[PDB]
């Protein structure tokens, strides 16, 4: 339908250009009327006068035809565009039908439960990894040094937040 | 054979087609009352009477289409009762009877009334092997009265400021 | 679905450009109404007037069609994107398995 | 040709199927986002957002 | 244009919430990938020290 | 945007703690590699002096 839409728009442009050239030839023939009356040729003046009236009414007819063809070309153009929209929406319907039959809501539910449980197991994995990575390097991070360092650098900012011997003697008791 | 979803789809299509035809025919009446006024300004009076007969028939047709749109929307509202029962309801008998009546009378402009009436006849073939009287008057192929035509001309002349003399 | 998404977005842009060119041609036809009334051609003025009213209502129709097609294209675009997300999460599930 | 190969009944069925498939897709994305929130609940406590 | 503006507003809210969910899941998949690389490197360290 | 900000905050805390653990293990693997080089060089010194 695009070829016929192109031909209707081209026909409307041809009718509009015909109206333009007839309105130009009307002014040319009126200048010729003035020159013929200045020369005194009344039969030449009448020929150019009927030419000018013909070009005027002819331009009105081409303008009205161009208006009608432009109306029909506008409606054929929205026909072509909404047909393209219809074909694209039918393609969307069949592609979603394919994807929603190959991946149901039950398969989505199972896939998402498996997703969540595998990240639970992975978080347990990284927890015991970090536990081993702390226990391997316990000797470079004593807990007392980290505690006293936090106390020092919190007292510097103004925030304000032995036992082994006692427990050894108590194990010696019982 | 009766298929319910086909009848529901075609009733919605009847509603949409009748809305578009109401808008289009009221606009055509707007277009043509101006040329009736042009005939009255030119002086030809019996010509304007015949054009007024055309436009009276078109206005009766528009009012008939809004009555049928009302009845098809009533069937879309009571479609649960239609699909449930097997005997025709008293609230549905007028609508079903006048749609089966008006579907051959409007075969040209609304081609889905033929399918709607075929589905209603297939649903109620046990009853049909009632019709709205105002709707039958508006679908009646009968010439409007001359006093109505003259009256119509009077208001066209009043709106378009044209001198017109009745009988 | 990406081809149909591209076609729906292109159709919305074509309807918007049609509304723009019709709103431009309305102003052009109104200038022609003014020139025709200054020349004293009332039939030419009525032709350009019905052209201007047609271009106005035609531009309103193209604008409303562009709004509807842009709505549907937005929802098809989030369909395509969440389908890509679904396929990537299924791949993550099988790789972690 | 186009109006016999794509009737108004086929348009009505195609549009009902279009609307219902986007309903099912919205349900899909809803339960997707529900899982995507429940997986990362520990990084968004509700009290901190409040 | 008003219903276009309201549609673009709510549409932008929906895209923003979807982006938040996908960014959460992408962050957790990214730390999955990184700690899997750490696991493979530590297994290689174990076998080389063995 | 608030739940995004809280997520980015706690997510950054988690990446920082993971980086601390991996940096500890990488320091100990690096002194493993260096003292293995020292061991091989001292074994070479032993056999050359022998």
Coordinates of C-alpha atoms in Angstrom, one line a residue:
Chain A
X1 CA 0.0 0.0 0.0
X2 CA 3.1 2.1 0.3
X3 CA 3.4 2.5 -3.5
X4 CA -0.1 3.8 -3.7
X5 CA 0.5 6.1 -0.7
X6 CA 3.6 7.4 -2.5
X7 CA 1.6 7.9 -5.7
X8 CA -1.3 9.7 -3.9
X9 CA 1.2 12.1 -2.1
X10 CA 3.0 12.7 -5.4
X11 CA -0.4 13.4 -7.1
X12 CA -1.3 15.9 -4.4
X13 CA 2.1 17.6 -4.9
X14 CA 1.6 17.7 -8.6
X15 CA -1.9 19.3 -8.2
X16 CA -0.4 21.9 -5.8
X17 CA 2.4 22.7 -8.2
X18 CA -0.1 23.0 -11.0
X19 CA -2.1 25.5 -8.9
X20 CA 1.1 27.4 -8.2
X21 CA 2.1 27.6 -11.9
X22 CA -1.4 28.6 -12.9
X23 CA -1.5 31.4 -10.4
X24 CA 1.9 32.6 -11.8
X25 CA 0.7 32.4 -15.4
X26 CA -2.4 34.5 -14.3
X27 CA -0.1 37.4 -13.3
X28 CA 1.9 37.0 -16.5
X29 CA -1.2 37.2 -18.6
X30 CA -2.4 40.2 -16.6
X31 CA 0.9 42.0 -17.4
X32 CA 0.3 41.1 -21.0
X33 CA -3.2 42.6 -20.8
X34 CA -1.7 45.9 -19.6
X35 CA 0.9 45.9 -22.4
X36 CA -1.7 45.1 -25.0
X37 CA -4.0 47.9 -23.8
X38 CA -1.1 50.3 -23.8
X39 CA -0.4 49.2 -27.4
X40 CA -4.1 49.5 -28.3
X41 CA -4.8 45.9 -29.3
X42 CA -8.2 45.0 -27.9
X43 CA -8.4 41.6 -29.5
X44 CA -5.0 40.7 -28.0
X45 CA -6.3 42.2 -24.7
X46 CA -9.4 40.0 -24.8
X47 CA -7.3 36.9 -25.6
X48 CA -5.0 37.6 -22.6
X49 CA -8.1 38.4 -20.5
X50 CA -9.7 35.0 -21.1
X51 CA -6.3 33.4 -20.6
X52 CA -6.1 35.1 -17.2
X53 CA -9.6 34.1 -16.1
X54 CA -8.9 30.6 -17.3
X55 CA -5.7 30.4 -15.3
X56 CA -7.5 31.8 -12.2
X57 CA -10.4 29.3 -12.2
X58 CA -8.0 26.5 -13.3
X59 CA -5.8 27.2 -10.3
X60 CA -8.9 27.1 -8.0
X61 CA -9.8 23.7 -9.5
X62 CA -6.3 22.3 -9.0
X63 CA -6.2 23.6 -5.4
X64 CA -9.5 21.9 -4.5
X65 CA -8.3 18.6 -6.2
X66 CA -5.1 18.9 -4.2
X67 CA -7.0 19.3 -1.0
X68 CA -9.1 16.2 -1.7
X69 CA -6.1 14.0 -2.7
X70 CA -4.2 15.3 0.4
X71 CA -7.1 14.3 2.7
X72 CA -7.2 10.8 1.2
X73 CA -3.4 10.5 1.2
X74 CA -3.4 11.4 4.9
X75 CA -6.0 8.7 5.7
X76 CA -4.1 6.1 3.6
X77 CA -0.9 7.1 5.4
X78 CA -2.4 6.4 8.8
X79 CA -3.8 3.2 7.4
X80 CA -0.2 2.1 6.5
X81 CA 1.2 3.2 9.8
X82 CA -1.5 1.4 11.9
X83 CA -1.1 -1.7 9.7
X84 CA 2.6 -1.7 10.7
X85 CA 1.5 -1.3 14.3
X86 CA -0.9 -4.2 13.9
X87 CA 1.8 -6.5 12.4
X88 CA 4.3 -5.5 15.2
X89 CA 1.7 -6.2 17.9
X90 CA 0.9 -9.6 16.4
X91 CA 4.6 -10.4 16.4
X92 CA 4.8 -9.4 20.0
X93 CA 1.9 -11.6 20.8
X94 CA 3.4 -14.7 19.1
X95 CA 6.9 -14.1 20.6
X96 CA 5.4 -13.7 24.1
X97 CA 3.3 -16.8 23.5
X98 CA 6.5 -18.7 22.7
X99 CA 8.5 -17.4 25.7
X100 CA 5.6 -17.9 28.1
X101 CA 5.1 -21.4 27.1
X102 CA 8.8 -22.3 27.3
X103 CA 9.1 -20.5 30.6
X104 CA 5.9 -20.8 32.7
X105 CA 5.1 -19.1 35.9
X106 CA 5.8 -22.5 37.7
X107 CA 9.2 -22.6 36.0
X108 CA 9.8 -19.0 37.1
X109 CA 8.8 -20.0 40.7
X110 CA 11.1 -23.0 40.8
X111 CA 14.0 -21.0 39.2
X112 CA 13.6 -18.2 41.7
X113 CA 13.4 -20.6 44.7
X114 CA 16.6 -22.4 43.4
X115 CA 18.2 -18.9 42.9
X116 CA 17.5 -17.9 46.5
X117 CA 18.5 -21.2 48.1
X118 CA 21.8 -21.3 46.1
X119 CA 22.7 -17.9 47.3
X120 CA 21.9 -19.0 50.9
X121 CA 24.3 -21.9 50.4
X122 CA 26.9 -19.6 48.9
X123 CA 26.6 -17.2 51.9
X124 CA 27.2 -20.2 54.2
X125 CA 30.3 -21.0 52.0
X126 CA 31.7 -17.5 52.2
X127 CA 31.0 -17.4 56.0
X128 CA 33.1 -20.5 56.7
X129 CA 35.7 -19.3 54.2
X130 CA 36.1 -16.0 56.1
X131 CA 36.1 -18.0 59.4
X132 CA 39.1 -20.0 58.1
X133 CA 40.8 -16.9 56.7
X134 CA 40.5 -15.3 60.2
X135 CA 41.7 -18.4 62.1
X136 CA 44.7 -18.8 59.8
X137 CA 45.9 -15.2 60.5
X138 CA 44.9 -14.9 64.2
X139 CA 48.5 -14.3 65.2
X140 CA 48.8 -11.1 63.2
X141 CA 45.5 -9.7 64.7
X142 CA 45.5 -10.0 68.5
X143 CA 42.1 -9.0 69.8
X144 CA 43.5 -6.9 72.6
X145 CA 45.4 -4.7 70.2
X146 CA 42.3 -4.1 68.0
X147 CA 40.3 -3.3 71.1
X148 CA 42.8 -0.8 72.6
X149 CA 43.3 0.8 69.1
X150 CA 39.6 1.3 68.7
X151 CA 39.4 2.8 72.2
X152 CA 42.3 5.1 71.5
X153 CA 41.0 6.4 68.2
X154 CA 37.5 6.8 69.5
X155 CA 38.7 8.8 72.5
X156 CA 40.7 11.0 70.0
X157 CA 37.4 11.8 68.2
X158 CA 35.5 12.1 71.4
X159 CA 32.9 9.4 71.0
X160 CA 33.5 7.3 74.1
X161 CA 32.3 4.0 72.7
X162 CA 44.3 -11.0 84.2
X163 CA 41.3 -13.0 83.0
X164 CA 43.6 -15.8 81.7
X165 CA 45.3 -15.9 85.1
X166 CA 41.9 -16.0 87.0
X167 CA 40.5 -18.8 84.7
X168 CA 43.8 -20.7 85.0
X169 CA 43.7 -20.6 88.8
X170 CA 40.0 -21.6 88.7
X171 CA 40.9 -24.6 86.5
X172 CA 43.6 -25.4 89.1
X173 CA 40.9 -25.2 91.8
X174 CA 38.5 -27.5 89.8
Chain B
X1 CA -24.6 -23.3 16.0
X2 CA -24.5 -20.9 18.9
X3 CA -21.1 -19.9 20.1
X4 CA -21.1 -17.5 23.1
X5 CA -17.7 -15.8 22.7
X6 CA -18.4 -15.1 19.0
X7 CA -21.7 -13.4 20.0
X8 CA -19.8 -11.3 22.7
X9 CA -17.1 -10.2 20.2
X10 CA -19.7 -9.3 17.6
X11 CA -21.8 -7.4 20.1
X12 CA -18.7 -5.3 21.0
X13 CA -18.1 -4.7 17.3
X14 CA -21.7 -3.6 16.8
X15 CA -21.3 -1.1 19.7
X16 CA -18.1 0.3 18.1
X17 CA -19.5 0.4 14.6
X18 CA -22.7 2.2 15.7
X19 CA -20.7 4.8 17.6
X20 CA -18.6 5.6 14.6
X21 CA -21.7 5.7 12.3
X22 CA -23.5 8.0 14.7
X23 CA -20.6 10.5 14.7
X24 CA -20.2 10.2 10.9
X25 CA -23.9 10.6 10.1
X26 CA -24.4 13.6 12.4
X27 CA -21.4 15.2 10.7
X28 CA -23.0 14.5 7.3
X29 CA -26.3 16.1 8.5
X30 CA -24.2 19.1 9.5
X31 CA -22.8 19.1 5.9
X32 CA -26.2 18.7 4.2
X33 CA -28.4 21.2 6.1
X34 CA -26.1 23.9 4.8
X35 CA -26.8 22.9 1.2
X36 CA -30.5 22.7 2.0
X37 CA -30.1 26.3 3.1
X38 CA -28.3 27.0 -0.2
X39 CA -31.3 25.6 -2.1
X40 CA -33.6 27.9 0.0
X41 CA -31.4 30.9 -0.7
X42 CA -31.4 30.0 -4.4
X43 CA -35.2 29.8 -4.3
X44 CA -35.9 26.2 -5.3
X45 CA -38.3 24.9 -2.6
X46 CA -39.5 21.5 -3.7
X47 CA -35.9 20.5 -4.3
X48 CA -35.2 21.5 -0.6
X49 CA -38.3 19.5 0.4
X50 CA -36.8 16.4 -1.1
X51 CA -33.4 17.0 0.5
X52 CA -35.2 17.5 3.8
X53 CA -36.8 14.1 3.3
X54 CA -33.3 12.7 2.9
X55 CA -32.1 14.3 6.1
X56 CA -35.2 13.4 8.1
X57 CA -34.5 9.7 7.1
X58 CA -30.9 10.1 8.2
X59 CA -31.9 11.5 11.6
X60 CA -34.4 8.7 12.2
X61 CA -31.5 6.3 11.2
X62 CA -29.2 7.9 13.8
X63 CA -31.8 7.6 16.6
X64 CA -32.5 4.0 15.5
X65 CA -28.7 3.3 15.8
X66 CA -28.6 4.7 19.3
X67 CA -31.6 2.5 20.3
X68 CA -29.9 -0.5 18.9
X69 CA -26.6 0.4 20.7
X70 CA -28.6 0.6 23.9
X71 CA -30.0 -2.9 23.3
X72 CA -26.7 -4.4 22.4
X73 CA -25.1 -2.9 25.5
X74 CA -28.0 -4.4 27.5
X75 CA -27.1 -7.8 26.0
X76 CA -23.5 -7.3 26.9
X77 CA -24.6 -6.5 30.5
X78 CA -26.9 -9.5 30.7
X79 CA -24.5 -11.9 28.8
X80 CA -24.1 -14.0 32.0
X81 CA -27.9 -14.6 32.0
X82 CA -27.7 -15.3 28.3
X83 CA -24.9 -17.9 28.7
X84 CA -26.5 -19.4 31.8
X85 CA -30.2 -19.9 31.1
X86 CA -31.8 -21.7 28.2
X87 CA -35.2 -19.9 28.4
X88 CA -35.4 -16.3 27.2
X89 CA -35.7 -13.8 30.0
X90 CA -38.5 -11.1 30.0
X91 CA -35.9 -8.4 30.3
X92 CA -34.1 -9.8 27.3
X93 CA -37.0 -10.6 25.0
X94 CA -37.5 -7.1 23.7
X95 CA -33.8 -6.6 23.0
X96 CA -33.3 -10.0 21.3
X97 CA -36.5 -9.7 19.3
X98 CA -35.8 -6.2 18.0
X99 CA -32.2 -7.0 17.1
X100 CA -33.3 -10.1 15.1
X101 CA -35.9 -7.8 13.6
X102 CA -33.5 -4.9 12.8
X103 CA -30.6 -6.9 11.5
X104 CA -32.1 -7.4 8.0
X105 CA -33.2 -3.8 8.0
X106 CA -29.6 -2.7 8.7
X107 CA -27.7 -5.3 6.7
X108 CA -25.8 -2.7 4.6
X109 CA -24.2 -0.4 7.2
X110 CA -23.6 -2.8 10.1
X111 CA -22.6 -6.2 8.8
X112 CA -22.1 -7.6 12.3
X113 CA -25.9 -7.5 13.1
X114 CA -26.2 -10.4 10.6
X115 CA -23.9 -12.5 12.8
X116 CA -25.5 -11.3 16.0
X117 CA -28.9 -12.2 14.8
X118 CA -27.7 -15.6 13.5
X119 CA -26.3 -16.4 17.0
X120 CA -29.5 -15.2 18.7
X121 CA -31.6 -17.3 16.4
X122 CA -29.3 -20.3 17.0
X123 CA -29.6 -19.7 20.7
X124 CA -33.4 -19.4 20.7
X125 CA -34.4 -21.6 17.8
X126 CA -36.9 -23.3 20.2
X127 CA -38.8 -20.0 20.4
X128 CA -38.2 -18.5 17.0
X129 CA -38.5 -21.0 14.1
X130 CA -41.6 -7.7 21.5
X131 CA -40.1 -5.4 18.9
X132 CA -39.8 -1.8 20.0
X133 CA -42.5 0.2 18.3
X134 CA -40.6 3.5 18.2
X135 CA -37.6 1.6 16.7
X136 CA -40.0 0.0 14.1
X137 CA -41.3 3.5 13.3
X138 CA -37.7 4.8 12.8
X139 CA -36.8 1.8 10.6
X140 CA -40.1 2.2 8.7
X141 CA -39.7 2.7 4.9
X142 CA -42.4 5.5 4.8
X143 CA -42.3 9.1 3.7
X144 CA -42.3 11.7 6.5
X145 CA -45.3 14.0 6.7
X146 CA -45.4 17.2 4.8
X147 CA -45.9 19.3 7.9
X148 CA -42.8 17.8 9.4
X149 CA -40.9 18.6 6.2
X150 CA -42.3 22.2 6.3
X151 CA -41.4 22.5 9.9
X152 CA -37.9 21.2 9.3
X153 CA -37.5 23.8 6.5
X154 CA -38.6 26.6 8.9
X155 CA -35.9 25.8 11.4
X156 CA -33.3 25.5 8.7
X157 CA -34.3 28.9 7.4
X158 CA -34.2 30.3 11.0
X159 CA -30.7 29.0 11.6
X160 CA -29.3 30.2 8.3
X161 CA -31.2 33.5 8.0
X162 CA -32.9 32.7 4.7
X163 CA -36.5 33.9 4.0
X164 CA -38.8 30.8 3.5
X165 CA -42.6 30.7 3.1
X166 CA -44.5 27.6 4.1
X167 CA -47.8 26.2 2.6
Chain C
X1 CA 10.9 -9.4 20.0
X2 CA 13.6 -6.7 19.5
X3 CA 12.6 -6.3 15.8
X4 CA 9.0 -5.7 16.8
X5 CA 10.1 -3.3 19.5
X6 CA 12.2 -1.4 17.0
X7 CA 9.2 -1.3 14.6
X8 CA 6.8 -0.1 17.3
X9 CA 9.2 2.7 18.4
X10 CA 9.7 3.6 14.7
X11 CA 6.0 3.7 14.2
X12 CA 5.6 6.0 17.2
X13 CA 8.3 8.3 15.8
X14 CA 6.6 8.3 12.4
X15 CA 3.2 9.3 14.0
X16 CA 4.9 12.0 16.0
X17 CA 6.6 13.4 12.9
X18 CA 3.3 13.2 11.0
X19 CA 1.7 15.3 13.8
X20 CA 4.6 17.8 13.5
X21 CA 4.3 18.2 9.8
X22 CA 0.5 18.5 9.9
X23 CA 0.8 21.3 12.6
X24 CA 3.3 23.0 10.3
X25 CA 1.0 22.7 7.2
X26 CA -1.8 24.1 9.3
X27 CA 0.1 27.4 9.8
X28 CA 1.1 27.4 6.1
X29 CA -2.6 27.0 5.1
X30 CA -3.6 29.8 7.5
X31 CA -1.1 32.1 5.8
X32 CA -2.6 31.1 2.5
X33 CA -6.1 32.0 3.9
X34 CA -4.8 35.4 4.8
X35 CA -3.3 36.0 1.3
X36 CA -6.5 34.7 -0.4
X37 CA -8.7 37.0 1.6
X38 CA -6.4 39.9 0.8
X39 CA -6.7 39.0 -2.9
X40 CA -10.4 38.6 -2.5
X41 CA -10.8 34.9 -3.5
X42 CA -13.4 33.4 -1.2
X43 CA -13.5 30.0 -2.8
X44 CA -9.7 29.8 -2.5
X45 CA -10.1 31.0 1.1
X46 CA -12.7 28.2 1.9
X47 CA -10.4 25.6 0.3
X48 CA -7.5 26.7 2.4
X49 CA -9.8 26.9 5.5
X50 CA -11.0 23.3 5.2
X51 CA -7.3 22.3 4.5
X52 CA -6.3 24.1 7.8
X53 CA -9.1 22.4 9.8
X54 CA -8.2 19.1 8.3
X55 CA -4.5 19.5 9.2
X56 CA -5.5 20.5 12.7
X57 CA -7.7 17.5 13.4
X58 CA -5.4 15.2 11.5
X59 CA -2.5 16.3 13.8
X60 CA -4.6 15.6 16.8
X61 CA -5.3 12.1 15.5
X62 CA -1.6 11.4 14.8
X63 CA -0.7 12.7 18.3
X64 CA -3.2 10.4 20.0
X65 CA -2.0 7.4 17.9
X66 CA 1.6 8.2 18.7
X67 CA 0.7 8.3 22.4
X68 CA -0.9 4.8 22.3
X69 CA 1.9 3.3 20.2
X70 CA 4.5 4.8 22.6
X71 CA 2.7 3.3 25.6
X72 CA 2.7 -0.1 24.0
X73 CA 6.3 0.3 22.9
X74 CA 7.3 1.2 26.5
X75 CA 5.7 -2.0 27.8
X76 CA 7.2 -4.1 25.1
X77 CA 10.6 -2.6 25.9
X78 CA 10.4 -3.5 29.5
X79 CA 9.2 -7.0 28.4
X80 CA 12.4 -7.4 26.3
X81 CA 14.6 -6.1 29.2
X82 CA 13.1 -8.3 31.8
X83 CA 13.3 -11.3 29.5
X84 CA 17.0 -10.6 29.2
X85 CA 17.1 -10.4 33.0
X86 CA 15.3 -13.7 33.2
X87 CA 17.7 -15.5 30.9
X88 CA 20.7 -14.1 32.7
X89 CA 19.3 -15.2 36.1
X90 CA 18.6 -18.7 34.7
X91 CA 22.2 -18.8 33.4
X92 CA 23.4 -17.8 36.9
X93 CA 21.3 -20.6 38.4
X94 CA 22.8 -23.2 36.2
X95 CA 26.3 -22.0 36.6
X96 CA 26.0 -21.9 40.4
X97 CA 24.4 -25.4 40.2
Chain D
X1 CA -6.7 -8.3 1.2
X2 CA -5.6 -7.1 4.6
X3 CA -9.1 -6.9 6.0
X4 CA -9.9 -10.4 4.9
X5 CA -6.7 -11.9 6.2
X6 CA -7.1 -10.0 9.5
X7 CA -10.7 -9.6 10.4
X8 CA -12.2 -7.6 13.3
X9 CA -12.7 -10.9 15.2
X10 CA -9.0 -11.7 14.7
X11 CA -8.1 -8.2 15.9
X12 CA -10.3 -8.7 19.0
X13 CA -8.8 -12.1 19.8
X14 CA -5.3 -10.8 19.2
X15 CA -5.9 -7.8 21.4
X16 CA -7.4 -9.9 24.2
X17 CA -4.4 -12.2 24.0
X18 CA -2.1 -9.2 24.0
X19 CA -3.6 -7.8 27.2
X20 CA -3.8 -11.2 29.0
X21 CA -0.1 -12.0 28.2
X22 CA 1.0 -8.6 29.6
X23 CA -1.1 -9.4 32.7
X24 CA 0.8 -12.7 33.1
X25 CA 4.1 -11.0 32.4
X26 CA 3.3 -8.4 35.1
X27 CA 2.7 -11.2 37.6
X28 CA 6.0 -12.8 36.5
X29 CA 8.0 -9.5 37.1
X30 CA 6.2 -9.1 40.4
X31 CA 7.3 -12.5 41.8
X32 CA 10.7 -11.9 40.2
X33 CA 11.1 -8.6 42.2
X34 CA 9.8 -10.3 45.3
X35 CA 12.6 -12.9 45.1
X36 CA 15.1 -10.2 44.2
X37 CA 14.2 -8.4 47.4
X38 CA 14.1 -11.5 49.6
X39 CA 17.5 -12.6 48.4
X40 CA 19.1 -9.2 49.4
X41 CA 17.1 -8.5 52.6
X42 CA 20.2 -8.5 54.7
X43 CA 21.7 -5.5 52.8
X44 CA 18.5 -3.4 53.2
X45 CA 17.2 -3.5 56.8
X46 CA 13.8 -1.9 57.0
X47 CA 14.7 0.2 60.0
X48 CA 17.6 1.8 58.3
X49 CA 15.5 2.8 55.3
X50 CA 12.8 4.2 57.6
Chain E
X1 CA 0.1 15.6 26.6
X2 CA -1.1 15.4 30.2
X3 CA -1.7 11.7 30.0
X4 CA 1.7 11.4 28.3
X5 CA 3.4 13.2 31.2
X6 CA 1.7 11.1 33.8
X7 CA 2.6 8.0 31.9
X8 CA 6.3 9.1 31.6
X9 CA 6.3 9.8 35.4
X10 CA 4.9 6.4 36.5
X11 CA 6.9 4.7 33.8
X12 CA 10.1 6.3 35.2
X13 CA 9.2 5.1 38.7
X14 CA 8.8 1.6 37.4
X15 CA 12.1 1.6 35.5
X16 CA 13.8 3.0 38.6
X17 CA 12.5 0.2 40.9
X18 CA 13.4 -2.5 38.3
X19 CA 16.9 -1.0 38.1
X20 CA 17.2 -1.1 41.9
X21 CA 16.3 -4.8 42.0
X22 CA 18.5 -5.8 39.1
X23 CA 21.4 -3.8 40.6
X24 CA 20.9 -5.7 43.9
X25 CA 21.0 -9.1 42.2
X26 CA 24.0 -8.0 40.1
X27 CA 25.9 -6.9 43.2
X28 CA 25.3 -10.3 44.8
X29 CA 26.3 -12.2 41.5
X30 CA 29.4 -10.0 41.4
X31 CA 30.5 -11.0 44.9
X32 CA 29.6 -14.6 43.9
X33 CA 32.1 -14.4 40.9
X34 CA 34.8 -12.7 43.1
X35 CA 34.6 -15.3 45.9
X36 CA 34.6 -18.1 43.4
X37 CA 37.8 -16.7 42.1
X38 CA 39.1 -16.6 45.7
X39 CA 38.0 -20.2 46.2
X40 CA 39.8 -21.4 43.1
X41 CA 43.0 -19.5 44.0
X42 CA 43.0 -20.9 47.6
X43 CA 42.5 -24.5 46.2
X44 CA 45.5 -23.9 43.9
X45 CA 47.5 -22.7 46.9
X46 CA 46.4 -25.8 48.8
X47 CA 47.6 -28.2 46.1
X48 CA 50.8 -26.3 45.4
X49 CA 51.7 -26.3 49.1
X50 CA 50.8 -30.0 49.3
Chain F
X1 CA 16.7 5.9 46.3
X2 CA 16.7 5.4 50.1
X3 CA 16.8 1.6 49.9
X4 CA 19.4 2.0 47.2
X5 CA 21.5 4.1 49.6
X6 CA 21.2 1.6 52.5
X7 CA 22.0 -1.3 50.1
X8 CA 25.1 0.5 48.8
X9 CA 26.2 1.2 52.4
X10 CA 25.9 -2.3 53.7
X11 CA 27.2 -3.7 50.4
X12 CA 30.3 -1.5 50.8
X13 CA 30.8 -2.8 54.3
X14 CA 30.6 -6.4 53.0
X15 CA 33.1 -5.7 50.2
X16 CA 35.5 -4.1 52.7
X17 CA 35.4 -7.1 55.1
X18 CA 35.9 -9.5 52.2
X19 CA 38.8 -7.4 51.0
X20 CA 40.4 -7.5 54.5
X21 CA 40.1 -11.3 54.6
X22 CA 41.5 -11.8 51.1
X23 CA 44.3 -9.3 51.9
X24 CA 45.3 -11.3 55.0
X25 CA 45.4 -14.6 53.1
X26 CA 47.3 -12.9 50.2
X27 CA 49.9 -11.6 52.7
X28 CA 50.5 -15.0 54.1
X29 CA 50.7 -16.6 50.7
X30 CA 53.2 -13.9 49.7
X31 CA 55.4 -14.7 52.6
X32 CA 55.0 -18.4 51.7
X33 CA 56.3 -17.7 48.2
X34 CA 59.2 -15.6 49.4
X35 CA 60.3 -18.1 52.0
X36 CA 60.0 -20.9 49.5
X37 CA 62.4 -18.9 47.3
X38 CA 64.7 -18.6 50.3
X39 CA 64.5 -22.3 50.9
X40 CA 65.4 -23.2 47.3
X41 CA 68.3 -20.7 47.4
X42 CA 69.6 -22.2 50.7
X43 CA 69.4 -25.7 49.3
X44 CA 71.4 -24.5 46.2
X45 CA 74.0 -23.0 48.6
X46 CA 74.2 -26.3 50.5
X47 CA 74.8 -28.4 47.3
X48 CA 77.3 -25.9 45.9
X49 CA 79.2 -25.8 49.1
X50 CA 79.1 -29.6 49.3

